[PDB]
Amino acid sequence: HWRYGGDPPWPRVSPACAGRFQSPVDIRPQLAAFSPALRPLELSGFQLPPLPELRLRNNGHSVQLTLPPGLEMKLGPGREYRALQLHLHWGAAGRPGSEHTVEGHRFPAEIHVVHLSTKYARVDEALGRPGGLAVLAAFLEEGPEENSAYEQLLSRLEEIAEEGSETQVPGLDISALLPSDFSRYFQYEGSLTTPPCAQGVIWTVFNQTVSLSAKQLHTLSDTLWGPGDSRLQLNFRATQPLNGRVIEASFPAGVD
């Protein structure tokens, strides 16, 4: 496979990673285009019952939770999606590791919930098509309290610490891993943030963060191993030039 930071650049092996409209990006809210057509996000089916369980796996680049069929997400008219999986990006002891930044600010970690457009039956058909995939992204920051929803996942990392290992977790309310404010977000068109870096992905970044305790953020960043005998840390791609793309905001943003 490929690696974060290490190895030689990605375009050597995956030339699409040198495309012009890549993710992640630095969001500057005062320069985002206010778009009142961007209405509150709509999710359904995200409150899962305890059974069947969900697969949780350390793939060497992140921890990835496989979602069951039936999770629906709507960005707007004509833009309906089904959720496939969620995974995270983080830093290290101290160091933040979100993928997107806000005015150059990097947050402790970031969650990505990846979705397939209802236009397509299979991910392979949607790759590279405009709108074929959509990601919901939220920043994770340090709060004073244990976050109970995340603890359901974070308490299971120790058992998948080795690269390639997997476990099963009870169904949970996936929407409780996301912010409560569905009305304020940024949206733009970019790419997958790992090879093959396919373009056409609609990114929606919540303005509101989710809060984890310090211990929880330490558990996320320090438990897993990656390729070789290396710790799975700092698993974020550098931000990419906008190259003339306009980031939209669903709310009046970046004032004072």
Instruction: Tell me the catalytic residues.
Output: 61
Query: Which residues ranging from 120 to 159 are in contact with Zn ion (CB under 5 A)?
Result: none
Nearest to 235 by CA among 134, 92, 113, 136: 92
Contact indicator for 187, 25 with CB cutoff of 8 Å: no
What are the φ/ψ torsions at residue 135 (nearest 5 degrees)?
A: -120, 135
CB nearer to Zn ion: pick between 182 and 203: 203
Q: From the CB of 3, what's the least distance to Zn ion, in Å?
A: 15
- Indicate whether 100 belongs to the interface with Zn ion (CB under 5 A): no
CB of 171 to Zn ion, least distance (A): 22
Question: Which among 219, 226, 186, 224 is positioned nearest to 100, based on CA atoms?
Answer: 186
Could you give the angle at the alpha carbon of 102 between the alpha carbons of 98 and 103, nearest 5°? Answer: 135
Of 106 and 112, which CB lies nearer to Zn ion in the complex structure?
112
100 is in an annotated binding site: no
Q: Is 115 annotated as a binding residue?
A: no
Task: Determine which residue in the list 112, 115, 218, 237 makes contact with Zn ion, applying CB under 5 A.
Answer: 112
Contacts 24+ apart (CB under 8 A), 118-121: 118/80, 118/81, 118/82
Confirm whether residue 193 is marked as ligand binding.
yes
Residue with CB nearest Zn ion?
Answer: 112
Select 193 or 253, whichever has its Cβ closest to Zn ion. Answer: 193
Q: Is 101 annotated as a binding residue?
A: no
Q: List residues near Zn ion by CB under 5 A.
A: 112
